[PDB]
Amino acid sequence: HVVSRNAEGVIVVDGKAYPMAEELVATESVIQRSIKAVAKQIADFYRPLSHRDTHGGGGVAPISDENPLIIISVLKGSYIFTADMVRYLGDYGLPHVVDFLRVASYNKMQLLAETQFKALRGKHVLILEDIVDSGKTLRYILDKVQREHQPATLKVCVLADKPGGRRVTMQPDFVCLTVPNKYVIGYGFEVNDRFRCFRHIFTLRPGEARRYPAHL
Amino acid sequence: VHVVSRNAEGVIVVDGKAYPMAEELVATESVIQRSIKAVAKQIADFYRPLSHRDTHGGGGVAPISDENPLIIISVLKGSYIFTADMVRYLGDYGLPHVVDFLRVASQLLAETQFKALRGKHVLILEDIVDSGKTLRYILDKVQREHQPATLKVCVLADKPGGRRVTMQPDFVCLTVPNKYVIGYGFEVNDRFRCFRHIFTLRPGEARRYPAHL
Ligand SMILES: O=c1[nH]cnc2c(CN[C@@H](CO)CCP(=O)(O)O)c[nH]c12
Ligand SMILES: O=c1[nH]cnc2c(CN[C@@H](CO)CCP(=O)(O)O)c[nH]c12
């Protein structure tokens, strides 16, 4: 990749201008290498574990295509990250299945979309989330999944950790990238759904946060 | 280049990985990605000249733009990997767009959250058209509830031999054999979605994982 600024001071990555960006955080190559390295850590961690056997009604059995790792992906920010991560988990041979939940704030938390999996009791569950910032969203999701599904173990993998944003204790078990204490965009991160399709992650110019006020 | 072979057990091996649940290979990752990117170029070429209701400036009609993007509705859970790949190609070709999701199951499980689609160009992204029944259901629902200016469909896969009702998507990335496909988003009880290639499933293996997740 080539990262530079044009004559207007605008960041250009591979010939493409990003006038909404303050700084580049990570190119696609760095992001993908970071995700694949975490996929290897996740596969190495879960491959030797056993949990409730729901395929044979038996007691306990190794993680397998019969009894896969349960992954709950948090929409919408995690969908692109999850699509890439599952393919790397497959490269490393980790048996797994994915369902989705969505949460939002009104700030207080509320579930927008429930998972449809119904047999998570005694299973290993991994949450895939886009970013840990204040820690409030993941505190809410972990408490809810833990009490409603009663999994054997519950862990979190984030694409991004913004360390300085913490207001409640939260350190995901797996972290692909560390980002600056700024609003990030690209690769699933957005402003009113814009910028999600970027292959790179950037910080946002402060004046751009209210650029698209109209609800979709 | 991909290496495709069979081991002593007669099992298909792609790049050193065995697929004992597969009958035949349909498409490698390289072929799939080339086909998605080609359709992304067609979708961007078709929509970038169009105009629709202006909700950024209130009214009236304005070009597709980051202010008034193309509205994409992705069908969960089957289309999520295809969508993640397609939106990045659409970005490559400079098509302004935003994505919302609907979830269907075999009933509507999750509704769209977008509320200002009236007079907007809307594109549905779906994994496969086989019998045509799922898309006939989604199209009627989206038209009635959102009143879009235009409603089109892009599928990763068309199985033309499976039709039971009339359904011709506007954009088609790949044609598949009249067989149950697995891989690249396609699954048996959520298994096989993460494969980078599309295969046909060995007969009778659709019952391999009977327990509900
Ligand atoms: O930097 C960012 N870029 C784009 N969006 C966000 C958000 C909001 N989203 C949720 C997680 O989806 C916050 C998790 P928390 O409660 O831990 O703050 C915080 N920071 C950013
Ligand atoms: O070949 C296949 N492999 C994996 N799954 C399927 C499905 C079921 N899914 C829906 C849409 O996701 C079918 C669309 P339709 O209503 O037109 O029949 C049909 N064929 C296959």
Side-chain angles (χ1 to χ4, degrees):
Chain A
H1 307 272
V2 182
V3 182
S4 59
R5 291 178 181 277
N6 65 18
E8 302 176 61
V10 165
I11 293 165
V12 175
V13 185
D14 299 354
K16 182 159 181 173
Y18 295 89
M20 69 292 298
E22 175 170 277
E23 294 273 9
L24 171 71
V25 177
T27 59
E28 179 174 52
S29 289
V30 167
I31 296 161
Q32 295 300 323
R33 187 173 301 104
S34 296
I35 297 170
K36 189 175 184 179
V38 166
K40 192 182 188 305
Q41 298 168 29
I42 293 166
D44 290 349
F45 181 74
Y46 286 108
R47 177 187 303 111
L49 279 46
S50 301
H51 59 181
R52 196 156 92 85
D53 179 12
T54 55
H55 179 82
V60 153
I63 284 165
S64 68
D65 293 345
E66 287 69 38
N67 294 293
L69 174 62
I70 303 297
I71 294 176
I72 302 169
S73 169
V74 180
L75 291 175
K76 293 197 298 186
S78 76
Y79 94 89
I80 301 171
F81 168 50
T82 297
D84 291 346
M85 176 62 87
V86 294
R87 281 177 283 188
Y88 294 127
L89 291 176
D91 292 337
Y92 288 116
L94 180 63
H96 71 267
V97 291
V98 174
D99 208 292
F100 297 101
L101 63 72
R102 186 167 174 190
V103 292
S105 62
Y106 62 89
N107 301 123
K108 295 190 69 66
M109 298 294 305
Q110 182 170 323
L111 195 67
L112 263 174
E114 189 56 276
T115 195
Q116 300 292 333
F117 288 170
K118 303 293 189 182
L120 303 201
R121 184 184 91 173
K123 300 285 187 171
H124 292 302
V125 176
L126 176 64
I127 306 302
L128 292 188
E129 174 65 309
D130 56 355
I131 190 161
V132 57
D133 189 340
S134 66
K136 295 172 185 294
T137 300
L138 279 167
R139 185 63 276 156
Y140 173 76
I141 291 166
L142 285 168
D143 286 345
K144 163 179 285 292
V145 170
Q146 175 60 37
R147 80 176 77 89
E148 294 179 354
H149 291 289
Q150 307 198 59
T153 68
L154 185 58
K155 288 189 159 59
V156 182
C157 169
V158 291
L159 161 68
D161 174 11
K162 188 187 306 185
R166 287 298 188 289
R167 303 299 177 257
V168 296
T169 314
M170 183 59 61
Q171 195 56 44
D173 307 81
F174 307 95
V175 173
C176 300
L177 301 163
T178 303
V179 302
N181 194 11
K182 295 297 182 83
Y183 192 92
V184 294
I185 51 156
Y187 192 65
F189 298 115
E190 46 66 57
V191 172
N192 199 7
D193 270 297
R194 281 71 164 184
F195 317 145
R196 286 200 198 270
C197 59
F198 295 168
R199 299 180 171 281
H200 324 288
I201 296 164
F202 305 89
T203 56
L204 189 71
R205 294 190 179 190
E208 301 291 306
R210 297 193 182 243
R211 179 160 281 268
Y212 309 109
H215 71 265
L216 289 169
Chain B
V1 49
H2 301 268
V3 176
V4 179
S5 59
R6 283 185 183 272
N7 62 25
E9 300 110 285
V11 166
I12 299 169
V13 185
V14 185
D15 301 327
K17 179 163 186 151
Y19 297 86
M21 69 295 297
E23 172 170 305
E24 285 289 348
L25 175 67
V26 180
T28 62
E29 182 174 46
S30 293
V31 169
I32 292 161
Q33 295 300 326
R34 280 190 253 96
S35 82
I36 297 167
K37 185 172 181 166
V39 165
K41 185 175 170 60
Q42 299 167 25
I43 289 169
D45 282 349
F46 175 81
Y47 280 109
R48 282 183 63 176
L50 307 183
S51 294
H52 60 179
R53 189 170 297 225
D54 179 15
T55 55
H56 181 80
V61 166
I64 289 184
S65 68
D66 289 351
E67 286 70 31
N68 293 293
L70 174 66
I71 308 299
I72 295 177
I73 301 173
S74 169
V75 185
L76 292 177
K77 293 198 296 188
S79 76
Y80 92 91
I81 298 170
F82 168 55
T83 300
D85 287 345
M86 176 62 85
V87 297
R88 284 178 286 187
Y89 292 127
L90 292 176
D92 291 342
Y93 289 115
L95 176 62
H97 70 274
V98 290
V99 176
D100 194 18
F101 296 103
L102 61 78
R103 182 171 178 173
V104 140
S106 182
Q107 298 293 335
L108 185 82
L109 296 191
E111 184 55 77
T112 52
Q113 298 292 326
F114 288 1
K115 302 288 160 45
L117 301 207
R118 179 190 176 188
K120 297 293 186 170
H121 293 307
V122 177
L123 174 66
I124 306 299
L125 290 187
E126 172 65 310
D127 55 353
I128 190 167
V129 61
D130 188 344
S131 72
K133 300 193 312 300
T134 294
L135 277 167
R136 282 296 287 269
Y137 170 87
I138 294 168
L139 285 165
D140 170 67
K141 174 193 179 63
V142 167
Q143 180 282 303
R144 283 183 178 277
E145 296 172 4
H146 291 296
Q147 306 148 94
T150 71
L151 184 58
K152 286 191 159 60
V153 178
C154 169
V155 294
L156 167 67
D158 177 14
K159 186 187 304 182
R163 289 291 190 287
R164 303 288 106 105
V165 303
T166 308
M167 181 53 61
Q168 176 52 43
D170 306 271
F171 308 94
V172 176
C173 300
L174 294 168
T175 294
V176 292
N178 192 8
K179 309 281 169 174
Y180 191 98
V181 293
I182 55 164
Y184 190 66
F186 296 116
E187 47 64 52
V188 172
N189 196 14
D190 270 304
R191 280 73 162 189
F192 315 145
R193 287 202 198 272
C194 62
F195 298 167
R196 298 179 172 283
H197 326 286
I198 296 168
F199 301 88
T200 59
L201 181 73
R202 292 193 178 187
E205 293 291 339
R207 71 169 174 284
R208 179 63 178 215
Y209 307 112
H212 310 299
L213 294 174

